[PDB]
């Protein structure tokens, strides 16, 4: 927005005068896990395509690693949900 760019220049002036988070970390972990899974899937599709240079060994090992990473994410989600339920059960 024009007013949005005004706000950007205002924050730049703020930085001039003056002279990441848990949700961010969880988003980063989800992005990393999804990127690994997509990479393994893409390599598997490339091997199924018949394109040269892709070895079945690498495909199978990468699928294995992607499965392990997915399971790790599932466990982290399970615990995190359990901890949230425990906190919300506190009587004030």
């Amino acid at each position: 927005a024009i007013q949005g760019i005004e706000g950007v220049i205002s924050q730049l002036q703020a930085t001039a005068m003056a002279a990441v988070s848990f949700a961010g970390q969880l988003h980063a972990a989800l992005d990393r896990i999804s990127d690994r899974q997509a990479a393994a899937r893409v390599q598997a599709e490339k091997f199924t395509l018949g394109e040269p240079g892709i070895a079945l060994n690498d495909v199978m090992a990468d699928m294995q690693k992607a499965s392990v990473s997915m399971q790790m994410g599932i466990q982290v989600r399970n615990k995190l949900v359990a901890a949230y339920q425990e906190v919300m059960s506190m009587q004030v």
Partner: protein
């Protein structure tokens, strides 16, 4: 398409089959006087080349073409034959017997060795797929 080992060993099998076919055709035509046109049968040879798809690394075997041997055709004095020349020598093929039997044996043993290689690899191939599940 094929896995690299499959392609290499299958090319080996096909090349050995072609060599065996050439040997059998030579052994059949050992006593032929004429072809379909009026020229003597010439012993065929098969030339093996390495089908090095990458640069000098590996590759199976391919057969460029079946060449006709250049050896003195056997001359038999039969002036009554219509195919005799001015001097009267009919031309018989240059097919040697011992060489063709040795070629048949060698082609058979290479064929069987490549078959054994494929059979050995196969179990490892099927056992690879259990890694994920």
């Amino acid at each position: 398409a094929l896995l690299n080992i499959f392609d290499i060993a299958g090319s080996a099998l096909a090349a050995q089959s072609k060599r065996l076919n050439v040997a059998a055709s030579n052994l059949a035509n050992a006593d032929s006087v004429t072809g379909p046109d009026g020229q003597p049968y010439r012993a065929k040879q098969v030339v093996f080349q390495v089908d090095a798809a990458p640069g000098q690394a590996t590759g199976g075997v391919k057969v460029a073409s079946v060449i006709e041997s250049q050896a003195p055709e056997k001359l038999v004095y039969e002036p009554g034959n219509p195919l005799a020349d001015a001097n009267g020598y009919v031309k018989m093929p240059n097919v040697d017997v011992v060489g063709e039997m040795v070629n048949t044996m060698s082609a058979s043993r290479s064929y069987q060795a490549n078959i054994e290689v494929l059979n050995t690899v196969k179990s490892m191939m099927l056992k690879t797929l259990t890694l994920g599940q």
